[PDB]
Ligand binder design. Structure first.
Ligand SMILES: [Mg+2]
Lengths: 236, 51
RNA sequence: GGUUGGCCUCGGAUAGCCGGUCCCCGCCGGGGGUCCGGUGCGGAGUGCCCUUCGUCCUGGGAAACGGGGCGCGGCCGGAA
RNA sequence: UAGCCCUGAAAAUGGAUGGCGCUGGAGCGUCGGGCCCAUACCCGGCCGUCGCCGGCGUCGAGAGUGGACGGGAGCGGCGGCCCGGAGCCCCGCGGACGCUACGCCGCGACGAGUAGGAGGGCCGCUGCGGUGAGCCUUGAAGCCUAGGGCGCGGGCCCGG
RNA sequence: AGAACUGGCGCUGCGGGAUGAACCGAACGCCGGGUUAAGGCGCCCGAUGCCGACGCUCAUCAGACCCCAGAAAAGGUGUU
RNA sequence: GGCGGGUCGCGCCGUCGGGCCCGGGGGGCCACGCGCGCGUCCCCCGAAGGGGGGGACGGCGGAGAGCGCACGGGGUCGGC
RNA sequence: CCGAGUGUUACAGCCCCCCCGGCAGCAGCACUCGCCGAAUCCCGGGGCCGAGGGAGCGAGACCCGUCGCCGCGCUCUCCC
């Protein structure tokens, strides 16, 4: 269970050669040559009936479909969503003030905390300034603004993750009756728990906001391009 | 036909030496980047310490 | 169909604009010193509302107009 | 002496750098970097034709570019009390699609065309011999259609 | 009017020459991307909305891109 | 008495070329049974015509069991 | 007298030009020398359009080929 022993310098290239990996691995002294169950029987449990039953389960299926598709060619792993990679931009560090664009908020300047295990970087304007809870945002729909806050050592709770920011719906009825699915007259009651846990993190950003004077008006304000404001003459 | 010199290991399927031709020419334009900037500061720190 | 509007010198370009005494047009505007500015900062690459989340609770700085309007009515100004 | 501009220099409906226009160029002459597009070129998709093919091995029991047995000598690797050895599968009785051979399937290159010649047409009209245990008053042919489709197309089908 | 060599229209689109059989590019299945050819880059019209560089030229008929659609002899202290 | 031509040696040149060699006194290398003898070459030894080491060999004297991953890898999927 | 602007002649008494003997450390360098370039050359990004199309010689496979080639690291010895 060892380390790499050939550290990378370019993606997919070892620094040490092929013969220099015949010394470092100590391969010159470990060269080697050295050399069902479907089930079991189940008892009968009956009269006049011995010699317990077959090794048999998960049998041949009840119905073959009339037409069959051919199986894929595989080609490469082209691995799924939860196993790619996470890539920030160069201009976003924990504490870099953002601008929400695609959301319902549309310009509400917020404070970046941490880039999650999913891709969506977590963010919050403090709710005493904005109207932003701990909502997730997508990486490329925000604008990094070149001012920074100092949250280098603040705290972040262990519990909140992708399973904390999702949505819920489940089909119990399957009949076209005049209810709206049985849960869609309904504002969601999961706010019983996030109200406590925002002040678990909102009660420690405000000592970090108010050090610099003009800043709490800067988050409470919003963003707009009106007259002579063009976004190629604006160092965000 | 994937392009050689745009993905690796199509160079190495066809010219296997061209991996070790490459990590000779990533070392020797890193250690000669070391050799310049160390010496370009060596005449820059010697001129600085005079004042 | 549009996503804030700029309420106005004359002109000069081998030159120009600012503020300012003396002696002139019924208590303003006209002619000369002199003083500034000038690759225009009294600068439409500029300017002003402004990017105004709202409100409460509360303290410091700015403030003596209140400012919308169904206002109420009066007044002269601006005919290309 | 030769560059530009001028004189030489007149033509009939009102008139032509194409026009509006153009004079620190939108003119002339020598040049630079940018930048715009053809059914041209390159990469990728799809159709067709042509060229050389690939399978009747559904052989889940098939696998061979050396194959068999076979006895006279020795290597390891099998199973020890240093001698030495067949297992026809089986605890699952099991393993997609397909080869209209006149059909698929793969790669590769090219594609304009009158006159003209071929090949193809499951395009069409009228009849005949066969064939569909076809079709129908519970509605055929025809015709109409702002109805829904397919075919590259000749055309076809369904609803009203 | 008649020829020789070779190319071309006829039989053939497209880009450019404002327009056109024949010029200059270039040859065509249907398409999406990229790039150039001949040409062009005030606005019709896609592109110089470059701080393009160097000199010439003023017409009371300026000049302005092969074929190509108006010119000579001769002359000028008009200007280099 | 001078040239060009064929050639001999001489030092002086080049990151020369042969992996060269040859012996002694950090970087790179798709470069691996000590146990011994199969051919070459070298190092030495007291010899004077053989012992012993080194190096290497395109040949014998020694000299299979696959275990799980990550992937610019035989034309994209998502267990978003 | 100071300063200027003409003009006169004069060779260090601003400076330049060319030789004769040198150091520093020189980059195709403080965007002029932009030269010609890559076995003497590679890394990291963004931007656009597309994503067409039964590989298991092995276990007699077995729910369902994460497979071939190519570059891999890791364990089948230990130490730190
Ligand atoms: Mg014909």
């Amino acid at each position: 269970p060892h380390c790499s022993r050939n550290p990378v310098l370019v993606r997919g290239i070892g620094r040490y050669s092929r013969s220099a990996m015949y010394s470092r691995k100590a391969m010159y002294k470990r060269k080697y040559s050295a050399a069902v169950l479907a089930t079991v029987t189940k008892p009968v449990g009956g009269d006049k009936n011995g010699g317990t039953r077959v090794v048999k389960l998960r049998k041949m299926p009840r119905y073959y479909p009339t037409e069959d598709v051919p199986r894929k060619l595989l080609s490469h792993g082209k691995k799924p969503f939860s196993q790619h990679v996470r890539k920030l931009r160069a201009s976003i560090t924990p504490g870099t003030i953002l601008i929400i664009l695609t959301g319902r908020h549309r310009g509400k300047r917020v404070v970046f905390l941490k880039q999650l295990a999913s891709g969506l970087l977590l963010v919050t304007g403090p709710l005493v300034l904005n109207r932003v809870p701990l909502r997730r945002t997508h990486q490329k729909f925000v604008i990094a603004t070149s001012t920074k806050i100092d949250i280098s050592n603040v705290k972040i709770p262990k519990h909140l993750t992708d399973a904390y920011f999702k949505k819920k719906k489940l089909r119990k009825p399957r009949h076209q009756e005049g209810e709206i699915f049985d849960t869609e007259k309904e504002k969601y009651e999961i706010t019983e728990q996030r109200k406590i846990d925002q002040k678990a993190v909102d009660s420690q950003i405000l000592p970090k906001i108010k050090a610099i004077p003009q800043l709490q008006g800067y988050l409470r304000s919003v963003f707009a391009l009106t007259n002579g404001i063009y976004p190629h003459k604006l160092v965000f | 036909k994937k392009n050689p010199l745009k993905n690796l290991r199509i160079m190495l399927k066809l010219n296997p030496y061209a991996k070790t031709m490459r990590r000779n020419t990533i070392l020797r334009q890193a250690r000669n980047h070391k050799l310049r900037v160390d010496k370009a500061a060596a005449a820059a720190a010697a001129l600085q310490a005079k004042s």
